[PDB]
Amino acid sequence: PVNPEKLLVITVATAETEGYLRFLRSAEFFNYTVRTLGLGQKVRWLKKEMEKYADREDMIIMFVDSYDVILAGSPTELLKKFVQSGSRLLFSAESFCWPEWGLAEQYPEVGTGKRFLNSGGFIGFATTIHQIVRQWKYKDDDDDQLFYTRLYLDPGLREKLSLNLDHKSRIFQNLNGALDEVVLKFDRNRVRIRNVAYDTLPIVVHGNGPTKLQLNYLGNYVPNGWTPEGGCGFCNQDQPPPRVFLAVFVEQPTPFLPRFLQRLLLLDYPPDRVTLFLHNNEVFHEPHIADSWPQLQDHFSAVKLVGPEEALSPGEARDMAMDLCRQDPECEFYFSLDADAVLTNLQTLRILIEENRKVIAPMLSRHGKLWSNFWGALSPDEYYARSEDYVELVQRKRVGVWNVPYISQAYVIRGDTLRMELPQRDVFSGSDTDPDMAFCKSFRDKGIFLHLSNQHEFGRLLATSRYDTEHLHPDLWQIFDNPVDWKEQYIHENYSRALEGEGIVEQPCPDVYWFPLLSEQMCDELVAEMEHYGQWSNVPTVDIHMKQVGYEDQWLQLLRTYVGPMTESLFPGYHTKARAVMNFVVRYRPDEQPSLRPHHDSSTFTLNVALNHKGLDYEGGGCRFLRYDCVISSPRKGWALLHPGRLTHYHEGLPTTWGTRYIMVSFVDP
Amino acid sequence: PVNPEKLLVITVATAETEGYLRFLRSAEFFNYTVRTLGLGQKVRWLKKEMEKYADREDMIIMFVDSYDVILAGSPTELLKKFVQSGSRLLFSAESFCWPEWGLAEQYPEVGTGKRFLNSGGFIGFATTIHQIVRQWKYKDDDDDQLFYTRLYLDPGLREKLSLNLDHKSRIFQNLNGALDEVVLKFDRNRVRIRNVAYDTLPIVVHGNGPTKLQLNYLGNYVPNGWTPEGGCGFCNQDQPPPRVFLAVFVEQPTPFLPRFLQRLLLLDYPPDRVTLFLHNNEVFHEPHIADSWPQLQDHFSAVKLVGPEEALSPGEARDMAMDLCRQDPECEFYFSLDADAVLTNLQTLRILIEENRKVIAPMLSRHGKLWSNFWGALSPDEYYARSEDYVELVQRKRVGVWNVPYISQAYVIRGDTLRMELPQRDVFSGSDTDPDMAFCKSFRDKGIFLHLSNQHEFGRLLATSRYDTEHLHPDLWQIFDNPVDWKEQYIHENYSRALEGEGIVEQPCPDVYWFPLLSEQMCDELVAEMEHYGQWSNVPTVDIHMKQVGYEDQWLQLLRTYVGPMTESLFPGYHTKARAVMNFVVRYRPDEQPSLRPHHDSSTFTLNVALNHKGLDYEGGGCRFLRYDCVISSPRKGWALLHPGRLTHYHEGLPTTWGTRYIMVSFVDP
Numbered sequence A, B: 001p002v003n004p005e006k007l008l009v010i011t012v013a014t015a016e017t018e019g020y021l022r023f024l025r026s027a028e029f030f031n032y033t034v035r036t037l038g039l040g041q042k043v044r045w046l047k048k049e050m051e052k053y054a055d056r057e058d059m060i061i062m063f064v065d066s067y068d069v070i071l072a073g074s075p076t077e078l079l080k081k082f083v084q085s086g087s088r089l090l091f092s093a094e095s096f097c098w099p100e101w102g103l104a105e106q107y108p109e110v111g112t113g114k115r116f117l118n119s120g121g122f123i124g125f126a127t128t129i130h131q132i133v134r135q136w137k138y139k140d141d142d143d144d145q146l147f148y149t150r151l152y153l154d155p156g157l158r159e160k161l162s163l164n165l166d167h168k169s170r171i172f173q174n175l176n177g178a179l180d181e182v183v184l185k186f187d188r189n190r191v192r193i194r195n196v197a198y199d200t201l202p203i204v205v206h207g208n209g210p211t212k213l214q215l216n217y218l219g220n221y222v223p224n225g226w227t228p229e230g231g232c233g234f235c236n237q238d239q240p241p242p243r244v245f246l247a248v249f250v251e252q253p254t255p256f257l258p259r260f261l262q263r264l265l266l267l268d269y270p271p272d273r274v275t276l277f278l279h280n281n282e283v284f285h286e287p288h289i290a291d292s293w294p295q296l297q298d299h300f301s302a303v304k305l306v307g308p309e310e311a312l313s314p315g316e317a318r319d320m321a322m323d324l325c326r327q328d329p330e331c332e333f334y335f336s337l338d339a340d341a342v343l344t345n346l347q348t349l350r351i352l353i354e355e356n357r358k359v360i361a362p363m364l365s366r367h368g369k370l371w372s373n374f375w376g377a378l379s380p381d382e383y384y385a386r387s388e389d390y391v392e393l394v395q396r397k398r399v400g401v402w403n404v405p406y407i408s409q410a411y412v413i414r415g416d417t418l419r420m421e422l423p424q425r426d427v428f429s430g431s432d433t434d435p436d437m438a439f440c441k442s443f444r445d446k447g448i449f450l451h452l453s454n455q456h457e458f459g460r461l462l463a464t465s466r467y468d469t470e471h472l473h474p475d476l477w478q479i480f481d482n483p484v485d486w487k488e489q490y491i492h493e494n495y496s497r498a499l500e501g502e503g504i505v506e507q508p509c510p511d512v513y514w515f516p517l518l519s520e521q522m523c524d525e526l527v528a529e530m531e532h533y534g535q536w537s538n539v540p541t542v543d544i545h546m547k548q549v550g551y552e553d554q555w556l557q558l559l560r561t562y563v564g565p566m567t568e569s570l571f572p573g574y575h576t577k578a579r580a581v582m583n584f585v586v587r588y589r590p591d592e593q594p595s596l597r598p599h600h601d602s603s604t605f606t607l608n609v610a611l612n613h614k615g616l617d618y619e620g621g622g623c624r625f626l627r628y629d630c631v632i633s634s635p636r637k638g639w640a641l642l643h644p645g646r647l648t649h650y651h652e653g654l655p656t657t658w659g660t661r662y663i664m665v666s667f668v669d670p
């Protein structure tokens, strides 16, 4: 048994990049001892280091890269596997032969394993290593592969110093040419990989060639990145703050944007330490931003608008917003947030900063689906592809902070990373690539990790694909594509609490029920949308139907989702599908039709919703039920009334004395 | 001016028939003085009477018949008109020439009036009359017409004694050949006739030839028979009773016959003075008569049945019933009453007897139409024809007792008239004539008047034309043809009082109403009719619909007539047409389906009627309304329940513990 205390890991690193520190923590997990050289040219550095270990027969030494390497096994298993190899210096094997390709005939014939050599990782005796590395006397420009290559192809030297290759990946697993051979193997508190082509559990995982992101994905688990019983290994889980530059971007017509601007005033973070930047490409949103801008500039320390008059493409706008933080030494962090991002959690900026990352993004997914603000993998064309664990991450099966090749719409970048590591302005611009794709590619080409955190519930994304802009109030027609947000602005706040009970629902007259349904904004926007049409009109009324305006299917879904479940709750035994042919708003002013004579309605039950206040917009009677000697004298605006429409409830519309009355009614279940 | 005290009216009468006494009362009305001869042969009697008045130049004498004659004018007008004639002996004129027809050329040419002579009535001086009547020396067999005839055709004798004819009916109106010339002329307290062909108001109306009934019709008004301001002239208007033989006849299947037999026990007349006779030609009614016969024989003094086993035609049965009264000197009156005659008034026998007539009948008409138990006129073939005042009599415009040529189904005959005036047995039988027609013709051929009285409301006739006899209870299917009687037996007695109010209707639970609808007989006959079918059977039940039995249209009319008006009364504002596709009776016994799970009904409102008692037929729960915490614990048999079927009334059929439950239900207004 070789003593672990005589195994040394030697690696090269000119800078402490994020890939190097990841390699170091995988080594400290297995309690390795690592010698880092320099905090073909690295062969010159290894050769110099091996002159101290020229006579060290007692020492095993393994040399690997650091930027694209992670350790998966313990040193004792590593030394044990090296003894079974029966070699004095064991190299790594690969599926390809490079630099020179014609040397493929030189190599010995291997049955099923890999045949060629890879200098990215080898292990052997310090004496045998020294006799090999010290023969190097060449230029720094020439690669390291060709040197160790033909030395192995020397048949006499191959037999004298016992040189062999890890043909079946017992210790070294090179990913290029074997991505389909590598899977992960989980355990209680550690993860590992397995070569299913030879059924081996390698120690060293090296992401050579175009397998960088494949190692970033493996690096999220191996060795203790994420464990099924311990979770993440490096995320947080359980006096002034930094100064941040908040950059809002409105590059497309975004629904509920007034709610976005009002939400910026509620982020739990000292506003005097946040500098707001806002770019608006749409002339549609200039009113909305103008309404909120007085509150914005009085809340934050400094603000700035770049409206549509500058005519800046989204790439040029994102360059300027980030460059204004890089050229400001007081900008410690840069928070870029798009308009189509709703942040339910109001501490994301604090939590994302405390993760102490360079580029971290909060995970946001559209309500109920899989699409999110990140890509688990890429295609050869750098287009989208689904990773093996993409769905487990979106569904929050496995939580933590993950090395992800793509992020968008929301991310926090360290300020010093911008000036020192990505100092150019053409981050988003410069090519025919999408401005959000060139952003992520600009960070990966610098070896910078794009972190995605799903440890908390952060928020959701808005469906802004087909946003019909030809409406006086476009957010009304958004009951289909963004229902969870449509309910927050239009459904009464105490409606959901009314469905569960709590005794807020009232029965003013026998078999008529009174519950809050619509919000004051829903009624005001509905009245305005009706008057904007203008063309007002077997008891007759002065009314306008939702069909001629184009809001029937939208109001029918409000019936299916909100009044149906409310009907079955108040009438135990009745089941409703919310079918209604007659949906219309009625006007009551003393100049035309101030009242409505007694009548029945051709429907099973009716829903009568007020649309304005009592005493502010008009003064007059409500709804009178003759057979019961009971009248709804003081109606409530956002509240609605439910009564059977046939036989039992002969009701009369009492006259309006002054002003104008608006009510919404639907003869449902005819 | 001739003094009325020297005008004498001479007439012939071998017996005081009803036609003679009618002529006498018309004379006493105008205060005439009449000499009746004998209480061609009557010429011998007149000639003998004229020998006392041979030298009486001061006396005017008018000779007319008595049986077919009524007086229409006063003597002063009669004498005044005779003076204007300028004649010493004025005869009556006629359209026909008889006996000998060839003597038509003898008569003087008359322009437009009647040309020939009629010896039925003449007026003149007693001296001129004597010189004419005393020339008669012929046989009693030869008629009186030919004697006075050719004496007028003697041209010299016609000019010597001044003989003329009332050519234009100034005084004498002979009806034969001038029926279209005669109309009535009314006044405040007297009636009169008018010859619209000459515009004269005659004094004497003589019904010669086949115009007997036409005079009976005129005799009902002229002179004071019926006056518009005084009404009838001889009817009643404002201590033992006689003994009567009551004869009931069942010659056809008659509906509601059990109610007829039970009604015979309620006629306000001493039963110990009534002898019941009943003929039943139908085997269908032997059960019904057998059920009531114990009560009949214990009520009346003597009874007798002649069932279908004797096989007697209706003519032979009516002969026997009346002959048994004629051959009984103790039978003072004979009351013949048919089965299809409902007597609402229970004093008709008393009132018809107190009219002191020979043959009087109470007027009965089918409810709402014109057909009655009498004919106002006849046709040449003695078939039916409508009289000028037939509709005024049926509609009770003109009231009183009327000389009518036909009666049926109900009449009271004096006993002495049967033995003395119509003693033969072949009254109804003897010819191919209908037995009811030969009855009336047998009385008119004896100069006996058939009186019809409509001074009171007596009753109605039953529609027994198409009586479907192939039913366990045939009176159920009689809601169409006899609704007024169908309601008396099947509709609850307190239903009509419930519709008007009086606070008998109850509201046991909110918006459910409880009112009496059906009678105990209606439910018992409906349950039996259902079990007689036997074939019992989206909540399911053990039920039988009215359609498969054949009682849907009948139950639909009960809905249209009785539950519709009851719905609109209790729900002000709702209008019902009583449309129902689902009408069925449900069984509830613990052996198959004892209960019914909570459910709604596919209808606007439902009518749930119990069909048996609580505690006598079964013991179990009623109807429970879940949403109201209210249960119909103790239902009432004949009562019904009305509740809305949708949404608001989720109800459950509570289990029946013992016995069998029957309920009638109709899902009306789907």
Ligand SMILES: *[C@@H]1O[C@H](CO)[C@@H](O[C@@H]2O[C@H](CO)[C@@H](O)[C@H](O)[C@H]2NC(C)=O)[C@H](O)[C@H]1NC(C)=O
Pocket: A493, A494
């Ligand atoms: C929803 O319900 C809450 C409480 O159930 C309402 O809050 C009350 O509002 C009234 C008038 O606005 C105040 O007088 C009370 O003091 C409030 N109570 C609390 C506990 O805040 C709220 O107003 C309801 N929503 C709407 C739209 O009216």
Ligand SMILES: *[C@@H]1O[C@H](CO)[C@@H](O[C@@H]2O[C@H](CO)[C@@H](O)[C@H](O)[C@H]2NC(C)=O)[C@H](O)[C@H]1NC(C)=O
Pocket: B493, B494
């Ligand atoms: C119809 O109503 C009358 C009274 O409104 C009912 O007559 C009463 O009947 C009960 C029980 O049969 C007696 O105890 C009372 O004494 C009766 N009152 C009178 C004034 O007679 C009659 O029963 C109702 N009809 C039916 C079929 O029940």
Ligand SMILES: *[C@@H]1O[C@H](CO)[C@@H](O)[C@H](O)[C@H]1NC(C)=O
Pocket: A029, A030, A031, A074
């Ligand atoms: C590293 O050392 C710690 C404590 O010194 C020990 O718990 C852990 O198991 C060691 N790891 C290995 C791979 O031996």
Ligand SMILES: *[C@@H]1O[C@H](CO)[C@@H](O)[C@H](O)[C@H]1NC(C)=O
Pocket: B029, B030, B031, B074
């Ligand atoms: C008959 O006499 C009575 C009273 O004596 C008288 O009222 C009536 O008018 C008289 N009738 C005629 C026709 O003169």
Ligand SMILES: O=C(O)CCC(=O)C(=O)O
Pocket: A586, A596, A601, A608, A622, A623, A624, A651, A652, A653, A654, A665
């Ligand atoms: O005006 C009211 O209060 C009742 C209106 C109504 O019910 C209807 O639209 O028919």
Ligand SMILES: O=C(O)CCC(=O)C(=O)O
Pocket: B586, B596, B601, B608, B622, B623, B624, B651, B652, B653, B654, B665
């Ligand atoms: O049995 C009851 O009381 C209710 C029956 C009913 O309503 C039905 O026929 O559906």
Ligand SMILES: [Fe+2]
Pocket: A599, A600, A601, A651
């Ligand atoms: Fe209404």
Ligand SMILES: [Fe+2]
Pocket: B599, B600, B601, B651
């Ligand atoms: Fe029911």
